[PDB]
Subunit: 331 residues, 3 copies
C-alpha cells in the first residue's frame, strides 16, 4: 500500500478505520472490510444492536486513545473488539432504558482498562487477552442488576438451581445450528447474519473462514454426542465458543499442520463441553457465561503450547492470518 | 526524626508502633497516630470490635515476625492492616462463642501467609496486594460455617437466589451515607466513627482525606443513579469500596493530576457497581463480598496503568502520601 | 542403578514405568513400587475404579508423549498423577454409561494440557501445579451434566442452597477417619486401601508416610474442633486434603525442621477448614470441591515461602523425598 496515502489521513478517518478493524478483531480478523461486513451482518439483523456495536467499539477505542495506548495496538483494533461485544451484550440481555447508551459507553470504556490489565499481566507469557475484557466488564456491569434496578433483566436471565424436553434432531438442527453458531459470536440469532460473518472472514482469510465453519460444527455435534436438548444446539448456543476456538487455534496462534489441527480439535470439543459447565456454574444467579468457555479453554491450550515440542506456536506479536503465518515460516 | 531516639527503642514499643501503622494502613496511611485514631473510632463504636481489631492486627504482625518477614515490610504496617480487618469481620458477621478470639488469631495469622503469597505473586508487576489477604482468608474461614458449626452466622448471612422496597432519598441518606461509607471500611455502622476516621486520615494526608470523602460520595450517588434501594445507600454499603478506590487512586499509586483524577473517578464508580455484582454473586451462599469489589476494580486499574502514557503511575516501592509523591516528582 | 540396564529398555516397559510413577506422584512419591501398590489398594477396593485409574494415568501420559513433553517430566510421572485422579473421579460421581471410558480418556488427556499450562504459568515462581489439572479438567467435564445428559449424576450430586444430625464421636470415628482420610485422596472409601496406601508411601519415604498419617489426623480433629457432624469425619472427608498438605509441606517443598513443621501444621489445619468452605461454595450446583482445598491452601503457603526467612523452602526442580532433601542440605 502506497506510503503517500498517509498524506490523505485525518484523525476522523483513522479513528473510523481503527473502529472497523476493532470489529474485525472480534474474530481475529485485522481487516477493515471484514469489520465493515460484520457491522453489515449485525445491522441486517437489528439496527439497534448495530448502533450499539458501533458505539461500544467507538467508546473503547476512544478511551484507549484518551489514555494514550500505543498507537499500533489501537491501529490493529485490539482495543475495539471487546467494545463491540460490550455494546451488543447489554441490549441483548437487558430491556431498553434511556440510560442504555450511557451504560454501553461505560461498558466499552471499562473493556479498554481490562484489555490493558490483561496485556500487562498475560504479556509475561506472550498469551493474548482474547475476549476476557468483554466478559469480565459485562459480568461486573450485569451481575448487580438484582440490587441496582436501573435496568431490568430480560427473560433469558432467570436464577435457578440446576437440575436434569430433549426435542428432535433434523436437517434444520444442522443448517440453523451451523450459521447461528457463527452469528451467536456477536449475539446474532440470524442464519443470514452468520453467512455474512463467514463471508466477511473469507475476505481476509480462507483458512480462518473454514475454521469458523469447523468450530461451529464441532461445537454443535459435541453437544449432540453429549445429549444436549436439540433447541440450544439448533440456536447455535454450542457453536459460538467453538467458532472462536477454531479460529484462534486454526493457524493464527499455531502454525497450521496435522498436529496443530488435532490440537485445535481438542480446544473446540472442550470449548463446547465448557459451555455446559459455565452455564451451570452461573445458573444460581441466572447469568450468561458469554465467551468464558472459549477464553478458559483456549488460554489453557495457549499456555500449554510452549511445553509441547510437537506443537509449533506462533509468537503472538507476530501472529497474523494463517496464510501469512505459513508464508513467513517457509521464509 | 533524631536518629538517637533509636537508643530508646524496645521490642515491645516497636511492636506497638508496627501495630498502629498496621491499622493506619487499612486506608493506606503509614502513620501511628492515624492508626491510633482508627482504633479510637472503633472503640468509640464498640469495645468488643476494638479489642478484636487490636488482636487481629497483633496476630498478623507477630506471625510475620515469627516467620521472619523483612523488617521494613513489618515496620510499615503492611502485615498488620489485613489482620485489623480479619479481627473485626468475624464478630461482625458471626455470633459470639468463646472460641471467637482463637479464630480471630487464626484469621489474623492466615492473612500474613496470603500477604506474603500475593507480594511474591503480584510483585512481578509491582502491583500491591491491597486487602485481598483479608478477603481470601476470611472467606475461607467463613464460607464453611454451614458445615462446621462451631460458630453461628448472624442474620446478615442468609442464602438466597437473587431476585428483583425502594425507600425515600432524604438529607439523612447523604449525611449518614457519607460517613458510614467511611466507617464501613472497618465494619463501623457509626457516623461519628466515620468522622473520626476522616480526621485520622487528615492527620497524615489532606488529599487522602478528601479522596476518602469523594469516594464515599461517588459510591453513594453511583448506587442512587443505578436505582439501589435507599437503605443500603444510607448505611454506607455502597461507599466503603469506593472510599478505598478513592484513596488508592487519588495520588498514592498515581501522581495526582486532572487525568489521574478522571482515572480515579473511573475506579470509584466501577467499585460501587462491582459491589452490587459481587453481592449477587455470593448471595446463593449468603456471604458478604467484603472489599472484593475494591480489590478487583483497583487491581484492574493498577495493572492497566503501565499501558497508558497519559496516566502517570507511582512506582509501588516508592509510593507514599499524595503530598510526598508530588514533592518527589517536582524534584 | 547399573547404567547397562538401559540396553534392556523398550518403549512399552518404559511407558509402564512412567505410568506407575505417575500413580505414585498422586501423593508426591516418585516410585514405581509405590504407584504399583497404590494400584493394588484401588483394585482391592474396586476393579472398575482400578481399571479406570490405569486408563486415566495411561491417557494422560500418552497424550504428553504424543505432544512431546520433555522426557524427564514424563519419566518422573508428573504427567500421570492428575490422569490417575481424572480416571477415578468420573465413575465415583457419575453412573456408568458405555461412553464412560471414552470420557475418562478425554479427562485424562485434558489434565495433560492443564499440567503444561500450569507448569508454564506457575513456573515463573517455582511453584508446582499440584492436582489443579485434575480438579479444573474434572470440574469442566462434570459441571455441565445438568445440560448435557450423556451421563447421569449419582446421589452425591444434589444442588442445594447451604443451611445449618451431629452424631456421636467414638473410637470408630478415629480409626475409620484416619485411614479413609488417606484412602479418600483417591476416592477409596476403604480402611484397608488406606492402610495399603500408607504402606506404599512408607516404601519410598518414612517421613512422608508419617505426614500422611498426621495430615489425616489433623484434618479429622480440626473438623471435630470445628463441630462438623461425625459422619463426614468418620468417612475421612476432612482428612484427604490435609493428607496432601502434610506430605507436600512435611519435608518435600520445605526442609524438615521444627519451624517448617509448624508451618506444615498451619497448611493442614487450614486445608480442613477450606474443605468446608469450598464444599459450601459449590453446593448450589451440587458439585464436589475435590482437592481444591489442598491446592488453594498449599499454593498460598508455597508462594509465601520465599518471603519468610525462618522458612527454608526446597527449590522445586530439586525437591525429592524428605530424606533425600535433608541429605543434600547436610552436603
Ligand atoms: Au469504519
Ligand atoms: Au468510516
Ligand atoms: Au473507515
Ligand atoms: Au490478531
Ligand atoms: Au470501515
Ligand atoms: Au443503540
Ligand atoms: Au442499544
Ligand atoms: Au453429531
Ligand atoms: Au458430527
Ligand atoms: Au500502638
Ligand atoms: Au502502644
Ligand atoms: Au506505639
Ligand atoms: Au502505602
Ligand atoms: Au500507637
Ligand atoms: Au474481642
Ligand atoms: Au471478639
Ligand atoms: Au446522586
Ligand atoms: Au451526585
Ligand atoms: Au507400571
Ligand atoms: Au508394567
Ligand atoms: Au513397569
Ligand atoms: Au515430587
Ligand atoms: Au509398576
Ligand atoms: Au474402567
Ligand atoms: Au469406569
Ligand atoms: Au479432636
Ligand atoms: Au486431636
Amino acid at each position: 500500500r502506497a506510503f503517500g496515502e498517509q498524506l490523505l489521513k485525518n484523525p476522523l478517518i483513522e479513528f473510523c478505520d481503527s473502529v472497523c478493524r476493532g470489529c474485525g478483531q472480534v474474530m481475529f480478523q485485522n481487516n477493515t472490510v471484514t469489520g465493515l461486513l460484520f457491522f453489515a451482518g449485525i445491522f441486517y439483523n437489528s439496527t439497534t444492536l448495530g448502533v450499539c456495536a458501533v458505539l461500544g467499539t467507538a467508546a473503547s477505542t476512544l478511551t484507549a486513545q484518551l489514555l494514550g495506548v500505543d498507537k499500533p495496538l489501537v491501529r490493529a483494533g485490539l482495543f475495539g473488539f471487546n467494545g463491540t461485544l460490550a455494546g451488543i451484550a447489554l441490549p441483548f440481555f437487558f430491556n431498553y432504558e434511556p440510560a442504555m447508551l450511557g451504560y454501553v459507553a461505560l461498558n466499552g470504556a471499562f473493556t479498554t482498562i481490562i484489555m490493558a490489565s490483561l496485556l500487562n499481566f498475560l504479556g509475561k507469557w506472550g498469551v493474548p487477552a482474547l475476549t476476557a475484557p468483554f466478559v469480565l466488564a459485562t459480568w461486573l456491569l450485569m451481575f448487580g442488576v438484582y440490587k441496582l434496578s436501573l435496568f431490568h433483566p430480560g427473560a433469558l436471565i432467570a436464577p435457578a438451581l440446576p437440575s436434569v424436553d430433549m426435542g428432535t434432531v433434523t436437517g434444520r438442527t444442522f443448517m440453523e445450528g451451523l450459521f447461528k453458531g457463527v452469528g451467536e459470536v456477536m449475539f446474532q440469532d440470524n442464519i443470514v447474519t452468520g453467512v455474512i460473518f463467514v463471508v466477511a472472514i473469507l475476505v481476509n482469510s480462507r483458512i480462518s473462514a473454514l475454521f469458523a465453519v469447523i468450530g461451529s460444527l464441532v461445537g454443535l455435534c459435541t453437544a449432540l454426542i453429549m445429549h444436549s436438548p436439540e433447541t440450544p444446539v439448533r440456536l447455535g448456543l454450542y457453536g459460538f465458543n467453538s467458532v472462536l476456538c477454531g479460529i484462534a487455534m486454526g493457524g493464527i496462534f499455531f502454525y497450521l499442520n496435522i498436529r496443530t489441527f488435532l490440537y485445535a480439535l481438542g480446544c473446540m470439543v472442550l470449548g463446547a463441553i465448557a459451555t455446559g459447565a459455565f452455564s451451570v456454574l452461573l445458573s444460581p444467579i441466572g447469568m450468561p457465561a458469554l465467551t468464558w468457555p472459549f477464553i478458559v479453554v483456549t488460554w489453557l491450550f495457549l499456555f500449554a503450547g510452549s511445553m509441547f515440542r510437537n506443537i509449533a506456536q506462533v509468537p503472538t506479536e507476530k501472529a497474523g492470518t494463517p496464510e501469512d503465518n505459513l508464508r513467513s515460516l517457509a521464509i
